[PDB]
TrEMBL record:
This is Type I modular polyketide synthase. Signal peptide: none annotated. The chain holds residues 2050 to 2140 of 2410 of the full protein. Residues 16-91 form the Carrier domain. The gene is mlsA2. It comes from Mycobacterium ulcerans (strain Agy99). It comes from the Bacteria.
Length: 95
């Protein structure tokens, strides 16, 4: 399918999955490549996100999740954690 239909896994299992996604996404988006060096409690701002990459990240996430998201994600829900919650919602909410 063209969606992150990752249902079947427990909520947290799914989260950490997409958490790693989000992390690897900005790891790539910032250019430091490591998703393990991504602090969820730190805000993407402090992590190095620019307005462009706040959009580029959204680009990667919306691509990976297979959904459609605003380039204001990072601004409305700023932190790897904030997005881990948003993206987890998006994928599980399919109505």
């Amino acid at each position: 399918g063209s969606h992150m239909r990752l249902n079947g896994l427990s909520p947290q299992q799914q989260q950490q999955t997409l958490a790693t996604l989000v992390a690897a996404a900005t790891a790539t988006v910032l250019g430091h490549h490591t998703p393990e060096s991504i602090s969820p409690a730190t805000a993407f701002k402090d992590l190095g996100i620019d307005s462009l990459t706040a959009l580029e990240l959204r680009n990667t996430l919306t691509h990976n999740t297979g959904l459609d998201l605003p380039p204001t994600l990072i601004f409305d829900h700023p932190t790897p954690h904030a997005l881990t919650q948003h993206l987890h919602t998006r994928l599980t909410q399919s109505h």
